[model samples]
Target: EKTTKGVQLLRGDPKKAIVRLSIPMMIGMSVQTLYNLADGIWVSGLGPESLAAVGLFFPVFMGIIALAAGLGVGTSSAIARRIGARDKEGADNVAVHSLILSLILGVTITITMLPAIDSLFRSMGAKGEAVELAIEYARVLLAGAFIIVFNNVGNGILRGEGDANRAMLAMVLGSGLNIVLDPIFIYTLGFGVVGAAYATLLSMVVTSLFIAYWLFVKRDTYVDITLRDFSPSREILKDILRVGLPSSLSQLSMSIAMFFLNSVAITAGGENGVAVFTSAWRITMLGIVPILGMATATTSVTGAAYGERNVEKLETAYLYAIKIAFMIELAVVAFIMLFAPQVAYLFTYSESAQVIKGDLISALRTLPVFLVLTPFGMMTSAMFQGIGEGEKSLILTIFRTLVMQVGFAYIFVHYTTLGLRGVWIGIVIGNMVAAIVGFLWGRMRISALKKT
Candidate 1:
């Protein structure tokens, strides 16, 4: 089989493969994280009202992201499996199916969400000008839903072919351009809060253009995405949905959890609490970028091993990825803990935002503690997706976000005097429990695979 360097790595030693594949993704995600942080910092300059508006809309936006990323993961896993089995035609077919699915889902999200924007925010308890601003912000992003979906699906095709370097290049280029555009649009162009959404949409369009050039124009990727070669296959569609749908549900669960947590925060600390969450959560995302990158590699690597029916390699890749991810997260936690004040300053530098500086700093210190535990749960879930056991990953995510996180948060907010602090602590405790449970279950699954 003709293979690219990335495909060779995917078919090589599991340990080396994980490292090689993850680094490019890590770099790309790191740039993306920087853009997110910078976007928050820029918007915070507009005052707490604008920040809350964005925060109010964040979960809804994440719902959109969840769907795209889930489809991407499904596409990646399907293609990786076909590659491992030396089925080039199957991989190419999966890529075609994935792109078509993305187009349909993207259009549907745009059509439905645009109409529901106002009612949705109002129901979530968003009041004041923040709700209006949220409506403005949501409309622009919602209109560009197809761009977001296409970008993710295209990146998934690159990743599934084990071509992470090109994926990394696109991400870095787009996100870097995004960071540059944020201030220009938000400040210089006087677009305010909605400018951030416009910047994001434009960046996604640019990334999609690059991905299209490679897949359709240059035609150099390992898994050629040829429309002329496309033939609809029900089995391929089923295979993609089997994993993609669950992965989407898992991400949607997180979005739903955040929505509820925003409510709890409102009750506990008011609108200020949502602002605090929005700020701290962006930092949390920045810290976890490395792990998220590694998780993608874990999905691809383990999927390939699983496709080859090599249980030992799959097990090795999963455990090794967890080890590296844990170490990386540990470092991130310490770095954030040590520089908590400096880090908090990024989000609270404006005079209007200073009132929550102390609370935000407190969150920065307390929230990162959970990063140390995420590798166990996150990597295990990635492994499940790799092996096409997407339901297990979804169940684990639901337990973590819904049962453990939301339940404990509710208990803490109502029962204890911890108040806003309770929300952070509850999330941490929930993750710890889920990590232990998820890790043990993963090991058991691997053992059962061994026996079979």
Candidate 2:
């Protein structure tokens, strides 16, 4: 295990070493988020009608993404521990299950969701024109769902093996291609907003190919990946699902919760309000990119420590990650607040007189407040997942995503005069509560681990 570069890197000074491991991932996530921003930006160019359609459909969109990520998180946890224990064949076996599970679920979800797409959006209050557009995007997205799962799980395998650089390459390949293809499909090919969906589909296909080549043919990592040698086992499936299922459910909670909030936002602000809120939220993901990067690095690195039962290393990983997270959030929050107006304006710049700026200013100001405490809450979840505390991770995520976010958002929106402002404030308030509680719970877990 010590022979692996990831292990060598993780064993060094926490601050610099963690940053190095995380920065590539941060850049990759930034590109990923940037493309999301691009989606909104391009659709916004089509007008508020287009932007509103994308917004109404986002909760379900986000849920699909969380499913891919949840499985990847579980796969990464398993593979990281196996690598730490120097069980090369076991790591390879887990990779097989990861790929197989991805194929089955990705196909099943696409099949089920596509048929349900119209009813789902209609129940969420989507109307005539927007409903049609949302379905178009869903069709394209579901068409490419299998490759999306493959890419995510493949990247997770790389991360577990402590190979952030290749992982970054695979991600950048898709994002860079998506950026190039987005405009071509949307405008030149005459697809309009649906073009964004088509572009993403193509990019994901390319990403899967590149990553598959690297993982299977290159054979440079700790595991052997071959489709022919695949075997399904309940033990391995349970191992992956133990961590993934709760995280997946936590993600599903976000889908339901966001559906409710979108309804509330539509009632208070209209479809235009939904668009403004969506645009601002997408812009806000820049702040989240680094937090996720750090947390991911922490998860993979500390999974090894957890595998080896090295509590001291686990404590060091959690503490240093939290410290760096605090600092990163401080700078990011200040930057977002400073540029709130300009950032908000970018989405609506095409509108005459840019009438949407005022709404965006408030949205930007409100959501960044979540950044202050969210880093800790998310890092706690990542840390817990790394150490085989998936239930604790699930509890933390549920408290943050479902309870704090949705419950507070509903209360503020329904009960207060704050209106749209109340909803935004609710997000920040939820993060604060989630952060405090999750971090406290994680500290107690460390105490328990200390005696082990």
Candidate 3:
């Protein structure tokens, strides 16, 4: 592969590069979210049962996606640093090992989850049609897990090589195909939930093929992987695990928390409660696109700076990302609060607008308050992850998902008189606590780096 002057964080303008990388990533992420929205929009027409089934399975699907994302963040940041340090051999080794690790994790998850698919749905309190459809969706998603895992790794390599545009294109292609095929499979082909799963799998396969061709045949990027380099290595594997494991745990914890939250909501509010909660959660995800985009950009810039040993520039990048994230968060919260009813109506138009009646309107109003602190929390975690502080980042992740969200969710539901409101309250509390901890941790890191 022809190497370009490795990302010059020390010499060139870091902010400019960040903006360049972040804009495309933001658009790509937005498109990816759009794919989900489109899927939901189309699937909603199939009736609430289909929507609930897909929605119930969303956390599990996201858990898998999160695992891949965690691995990619670590791999990209590590390889980027190696490249910046002019250690091409180290970069290649990391790339190769990350690819191998991705496959192993993917296969392991598939094997482990396939047997427990039915129980997973049942444990989540899914019933009747939702349980059946969720199983079908989860099974197909598990069967094709490798494609998502490997493709994310390949894209991470591209990003490490300063080819965010190419990475964005690869993601766009996958999500775009999923958007188109969703309708064709679900409606025209009459495959139901299985059809949605098939569409997602096909999209991932196409994306993986595109990335493989580019990395292998085109060889235009920095880290190229051939068949011969697929075996695991001790040192390289260590690096991958060091960064990936924490992110994976954080992600896994969030999924588990969601499972528990769903159960809690079911106990307090029934199927209607689960439906309300899921709808709000999806909307919250939509609002965080910019936060995620900024975090992604921070990772790339911070990794490059860390590689160049540009401590000052790295701090600047972190501050800039956090500022941008906070501003965006405020703006989103304001808009959502103002248009709560309108926004909720898009999901379901029930006659009653009561908060306990599963009205999307009530969810929009109350649930959006929890999102105020999400950007800070998200950006903070992303900053640490980008700078190779995987342990700290993982702790932040666990605190947000498990310690605060799940712990409080359980307490709020069983111990408090708040009932279902406790669930959303727990979310707000988690975001606040995690954001504070993350900000403090980030400041400490900056202080240490400055002293060094």
Candidate 4:
């Protein structure tokens, strides 16, 4: 009934193993994208002022999400490695410690940021009613921070143990609950923005409690979490941090890069430009989510392969992940390229639908060309993390998100006449450079470890 096949990863068809592992996370992430879309649609109906308030919350909110994801990456690799070594106890210990770590990080961030919520909104340029609404939203969201953290990290625990179905169900069900609660809270209960935040918070709490019960009480999971016998181990923490710190920082770096990119977008095109570019970016992520799942799925199998010192299995996983990732991305790119206008027009406002749609379509078309290399940029980093060479993965990610994109964006915009389109071009340049290097770097890695 379950495809939690950590043990079979080496023995079975590598491609099939990866696909089975990747699909749940993909569907779960797909539902997650819809969660944002539905949330945005409801907020948009509340009018531009409400929508803008929600947009402002994005980067700050993504920071928290990114941290959880990075820690999950660490948890996945560490657990996968232990299981490959056939050490169930070590894997169990890591699972408990990971959950504990998630709790600590969640609490710490919430405590530190609560006092700053007022000023945080102000710093982002919110004023008057907008600031008040932002505070209302962040306070509730942060207050229930543990729920979100636990939910995400719990998904990782399940993933590392090869139970992607539960993680998928947890994510999809939470989003479904949010969709049902959104109108009830926002309209019927008149909670407004606060209501939206509450819907999201409570949805996660419900699913999170289920995950907790599964791990702690049900005693049915492949990975045994011994919280009663838990004591923090430096070795475990080191393994976690070895990958987690860099992965966390890499994910955070994207937020920072995006903050700068938005600034550049505004300068090059104005408020309307931001709107167009935002729509295009939204479309881009729709395709990117599956790739993210594929990237995460790669780690467990690759880690196990590395642990076993089975070059054939490791190479099999590494090659097939790339093949599958590229196939998915290319299909996504073709769809975007073919229907660029319709995609852009979906986000076009009625008032300026004609005025912005042209520019939006151009922006949308320009960006996906670069995204052709997305699988390369993302999977290479995941591969390095899987092989326990977290440093190499971190380096590749930094270049893709920061050095290449930001630098190219700045120079191309100032030195040439592409205007805001220059920003799109800059992104392509970044991914292209990162992909070529990442691919070569991966080759070097494989050659160094070629089976004797």
Alpha-carbon TM-score of each model against the true structure: 0.92, 0.90, 0.89, 0.95
**Candidate 1 segments exceeding 4 Å error:** 46-50, 122-129, 266-271, 350-355, 360-365, 415-417, 420-422
User: Against the true structure, what is every candidate's RMSD?
Assistant: 2.4, 2.8, 3.0, 2.1
Model 2, 226-289: lDDT tens per residue?
7776677887788788888877887777666666777777766767666666666567666788
Better of 1 and 4 by TM-score: 4
- Candidate 3 wrong stretches, greater than 4 Å: 1-11, 118-129, 227-232, 263-271, 350-353, 356-372, 406-426
The lowest-lDDT stretch of 10 consecutive residues in candidate 3 is 2-11
Residue-level lDDT for 297 in candidate 4: 78
Clashing residue pairs for model 2: none
lDDT of 4 by residue, 390-451 (tens): 87888887887789988888887789888888888888888899898998898788778884
lDDT of each: 0.89, 0.79, 0.77, 0.80
Q: For candidate 2, what is the TM-score? A: 0.90
lDDT ranking, high to low: 1, 4, 2, 3
Give residue 424's lDDT in candidate 4 (0 to 100): 88
